[PDB]
Design a binder for this molecule. Structure first.
Ligand SMILES: [Zn+2]
Ligand SMILES: [Zn+2]
Ligand SMILES: [Zn+2]
Ligand SMILES: [Zn+2]
Ligand SMILES: [Zn+2]
Ligand SMILES: [Zn+2]
Ligand SMILES: [Zn+2]
Ligand SMILES: [Zn+2]
Ligand SMILES: [Zn+2]
Ligand SMILES: [Zn+2]
Ligand SMILES: [Zn+2]
Ligand SMILES: [Zn+2]
Lengths: 112, 110, 110, 112, 110, 110
């Protein structure tokens, strides 16, 4: 089966349900759900990771990225370091997350 | 399906159309109900319908017209303001218009 | 579609064609009725039809040919000037032409 | 009917038969033929212009351009000035011509 | 398709998939047989099959993940090193990973 | 349909394939008959067939692999040399390889 993880972002961009979660480009999981937290109004992503990937630290990072230039958006799981480190279990939360870039802001940067 | 109405005036709506999605942090929370030029000012007035369960939106919140991906569809990004709450029929004052390719090129070049 | 006719001469119309939309602030308020080179000046004269309900457009208003998105179709942006009102058969003197990629590249490089 | 004009380029790029010839973006003619001159190995373009466009000077220019960013290639006819000036007739040649840009050279410029 | 097996570990395979082409100087000489994360290191290990007639590839050779055109599919470019020959079951140590757009933009901007 | 054969070795042919067009000044004058890695050098050897009526091509001429438009197909541009003539079976020494996106990005960035 699979085990559940939670990750909150400021902006998920083009992320949707059944979006792939990948390590080093290799798909190891899928985005199960996306829901705005009622108090913080921040996108909370519920992901399901294949059970055979057990040794993922809680220091690991999630970055929302895009395949190619115009392709679909996905979650890149950067394997964390192993200082007391704890492995991610079912129902745990990945604290270190990077949000999706916004074209207008990137242009805002490049121009101004 | 229950919703409350909000109004937002822009200088340029760009590719915005009816049923365009209104999203917070990329998550769709509403839809563009109508778009109409104000009879007096000739400025685009956008009429939005927001899902009722998203009630706690301050009036300090911002609206920015953006594009999904590089070539995708145009949408309204609702930037949540810091913490008066917006009710049915209220107006969001702080709005950002849609980018214009010619103007961006005009900026980059000249 | 009750409309009134307007004329606008450009140096270059670019991708403009018949039935091209004329928009104010992104809101379509009219259509490109015809495009024809003036017999005397060999400059593109564009014949536009604007919806009758948008009457209060001053003659100080401008027309700029722009593109929807990056690769989309070309359209006429009518910039409403500040304030004589434009009537049926009048001519918009102030026009901005369509950009040419080769020239943009020529600029960017040289 | 139509009248014929000839224009030699160094490189025609994506130009082909039945390609549009336009003034100020308005199509006024079509590319009838393209053939390499046997001695000079330069692309010679034979164009046909609608008869009703009579007052085109021989000082006019032809530039091969592209519609949009990825669209098809066409001939932009820049109306010449009217100094003894002669109008273009059937079988005449447009001397002032600009060739089609090459992506590799443009990149070569931008980089080096 | 008589072939011999090779292994190559990357930090990121990007768009690489099964049946992805392995090419020398643009000429396809093999195929990506499999891709699997090493159980111990959690790093992508790519299993390649190279056509038997290309035997004289030294072990100093390099693998770089590249893209055909601008938007095309991703492939493995095998750069033949100058001159021990690679056999069936060997491992290419020298590998260059697939670029990430976000990082490229991050570089270009910052 | 009559043709004479020419050979050209590159470091990288890129997207070149069989039946790729060989053009002078954009005008197609020949086709890529075959592509094969040299057994000794592991370098792409391109076998071209040129229409017989284009006989007067000097051996000082150059071959450059280019792309049609921005996203179009890959082709061989034959740059006519200044004024020994190339015959059937001769080899063009001066060749330019196909650009690599990663290398161009590598150049632009680093
Ligand atoms: Zn669970
Ligand atoms: Zn451990
Ligand atoms: Zn309401
Ligand atoms: Zn409150
Ligand atoms: Zn009328
Ligand atoms: Zn008035
Ligand atoms: Zn004739
Ligand atoms: Zn005259
Ligand atoms: Zn094997
Ligand atoms: Zn050896
Ligand atoms: Zn032969
Ligand atoms: Zn000679």
């Amino acid at each position: 089966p699979t085990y559940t993880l939670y990750a909150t972002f400021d902006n998920i961009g083009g992320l949707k349900a059944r979006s792939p979660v990948s390590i080093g480009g290799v798909v190891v999981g899928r985005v199960a759900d996306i829901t705005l937290d009622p108090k913080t109004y921040l996108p909370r992503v519920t992901l399901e990771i294949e059970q055979r990937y057990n040794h993922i630290p809680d220091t690991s990072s999630l970055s929302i990225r895009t395949s190619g230039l115009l392709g679909e958006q996905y979650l890149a799981l950067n394997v964390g370091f192993e200082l007391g480190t704890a492995i991610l279990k079912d129902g745990d939360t990945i604290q270190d997350t990077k949000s999706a870039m916004v074209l207008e802001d990137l242009i805002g940067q490049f121009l101004y």
